[PDB]
């Protein structure tokens, strides 16, 4: 009965159980311990223990990250309980786009730009990135930008490029008042005559968070920008035509 193949297949299942245990605890380095909806630690944390901490040494003198560690949202959250029991939605108390909740949420990432391997800003406007140019597809610069209400909101003045990846990440759009906003590349349709933005009506473009420097964008800013624009799919759909 107990031959070598049998011993091997039993040994593998013991190995695999250990491997799954390792993999699951490794995947608990963010977001745990579990919390109650009031924010206090939950009683049932599951059958897997928290992993012991590990450290990353970040490049360019940016410090170290130790996970897991005591965590915090580091921002106000404008939502209210809608039920005494757990499991029910929390409703926005205010303007969810402006308050950045739900699909418009952003994370308090570092207010510093991501850097490339050489310590330079990873994302730059094309007008500040020597050599870069549109090499294929429709060049959107100078094209008009149109929201889901079919009204024009501005025109494309530049493209923000991921230098190491050679990839367009943001369109910079000038509004009727002369200020500009960044629009994620993944959220626009570059057409032959226009750029169409389905997520926002023309009058919600001005509510896009602004950046504090004309030639760089921080990780915090990217998260606020991208979360605002994505939250338009749920919270601007009243103003989305047909």
């Amino acid at each position: 009965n107990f031959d070598l193949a049998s011993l091997a297949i039993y040994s593998f299942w013991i190995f695999l159980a250990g491997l799954i245990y390792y993999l699951q605890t490794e995947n608990m380095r963010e977001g745990y311990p579990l919390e109650n909806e009031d924010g206090t630690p939950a009683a049932n944390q599951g059958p897997f223990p928290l992993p012991k901490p590990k450290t990353f040494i970040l490049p360019h003198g940016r410090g170290t990250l130790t996970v897991p560690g005591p965590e915090s949202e580091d921002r106000p959250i404008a939502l209210a309980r809608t039920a005494v029991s757990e499991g029910f939605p929390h409703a926005p108390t205010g303007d969810p786009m402006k308050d950045g909740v739900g699909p418009a949420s952003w994370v308090a990432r570092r207010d510093l730009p991501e850097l490339d391997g050489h310590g330079h800003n990873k994302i730059k406007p094309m007008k500040a990135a020597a050599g870069f140019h549109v090499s294929a597809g429709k060049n959107p610069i100078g094209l008009p930008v149109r929201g889901c209400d079919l009204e024009i909101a501005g025109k494309v003045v530049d493209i923000w490029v991921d230098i190491p990846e050679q990839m367009a990440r943001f369109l910079e759009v000038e509004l009727k008042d002369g200020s500009t906003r960044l629009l994620p590349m993944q959220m626009v349709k570059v057409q032959s005559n226009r750029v169409h933005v389905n997520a926002l009506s023309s009058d919600l473009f001005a509510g896009i968070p602004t950046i504090k420097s004309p030639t760089e964008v921080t990780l915090l800013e990217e998260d606020k920008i991208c979360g605002y624009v994505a939250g338009g799919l749920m919270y601007a759909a009243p103003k989305r035509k047909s």
């Binding site: 699951q24 380095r29 990353f56 991501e114 090499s135 959107p140 490029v161």
Partner: protein, 301 residues
């Protein structure tokens, strides 16, 4: 809506020459041309490439392996280019017949050429393995790639080398031919009593299927959150953003648990690596320990 499967606007700039770290820059090629065609799906830049001693050695033995097989195919084709093209998928360089055991004294036309080809292949693959280790070390990286590559090498080693040695003859090894190695694979299952009943073969299939499941899930997930920069996975590990949080919450709400940006890549590497790791065990045990998997299975239910 835009799906981000193909790039909308390609942008091009000066070629990226790469990180330097401890790389010996003498062995780096020049920069190749940009490919607009490739640029629709991924990066357009071609090269540079690093070519040091192990690379050159690997390419050399690699081509020798290729040439040995090719010369034999021309011989089987009576040096006729039309017969060559017509029967390309049917030619085969077979190992020595069982009579020659593990001897290296088989005449070329009778399996000697196979041993010579296998020698070249063995040098090319192992020097390529060393190259994936050293290319990582020169850049200060972890050795995960070289380790993952060892799992693929394991199954290849079992098939061509370890199992034939434990069996007592080179004739147990796999022939070099398109259709002939398919026939080898089917005959191997018949001879060993149906590989479906080899539990390590079943495990290998679960991890192969699970690899397509996992990459579909992870590729789709990252694309779904690329509107938040989700594909910048290294910085999302260092400084979790809403891309990582939505990615995790999609899967928690769907199936009740989730990964982290770093941890999904540990799931990924093990999923794939287990394919050939269990596969190699299952092949290694066939004919050495278990002769008939179906009959073995019947007494272990």
């Amino acid at each position: 809506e835009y799906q981000n499967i193909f790039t909308q606007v390609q942008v091009r700039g000066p070629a990226d020459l790469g990180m330097t770290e401890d790389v010996n820059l003498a062995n780096r090629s020049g920069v190749g041309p940009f490919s607009t065609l490739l640029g629709w799906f991924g990066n357009a830049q071609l090269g540079p490439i690093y070519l040091g001693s192990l690379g050159v050695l690997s390419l050399f033995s690699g081509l020798m392996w290729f040439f040995t097989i090719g010369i034999w195919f021309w011989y089987q084709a009576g040096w006729n280019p039309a017969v060559f093209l017509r029967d390309l998928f049917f030619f085969s360089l077979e190992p020595p017949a069982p009579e020659y055991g593990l001897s290296f004294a088989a005449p070329l036309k009778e399996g000697g050429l196979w041993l010579i080809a296998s020698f070249f292949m063995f040098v090319a693959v192992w020097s390529w393995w060393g190259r994936t280790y050293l290319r990582a070390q020169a850049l200060g990286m972890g050795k995960h790639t070289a380790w993952a590559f060892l799992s693929a090498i394991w199954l290849w080693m079992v098939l061509g080398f370890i199992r034939p040695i434990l069996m007592g003859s080179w004739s147990e090894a796999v022939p070099y031919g398109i259709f002939s190695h398919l026939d080898w694979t089917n005959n191997f299952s018949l001879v060993h009593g149906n590989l479906h009943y080899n539990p390590f073969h079943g495990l290998s299939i679960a991890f192969l299927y699970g690899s397509a499941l996992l990459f579909a899930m992870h590729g789709a997930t990252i694309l779904a959150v690329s509107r938040f920069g989700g594909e910048r996975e290294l910085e999302q590990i260092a400084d979790r953003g809403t891309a990582a949080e939505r990615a995790a919450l999609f899967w928690r709400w769907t199936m009740g648990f989730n990964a982290t940006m770093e941890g999904i890549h540990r799931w990924a590497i093990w999923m794939a690596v287990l394919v050939t790791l269990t596969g190699g065990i299952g092949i290694l045990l066939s004919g050495t320990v278990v002769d008939n998997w179906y009959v073995w299975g019947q007494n272990h239910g």
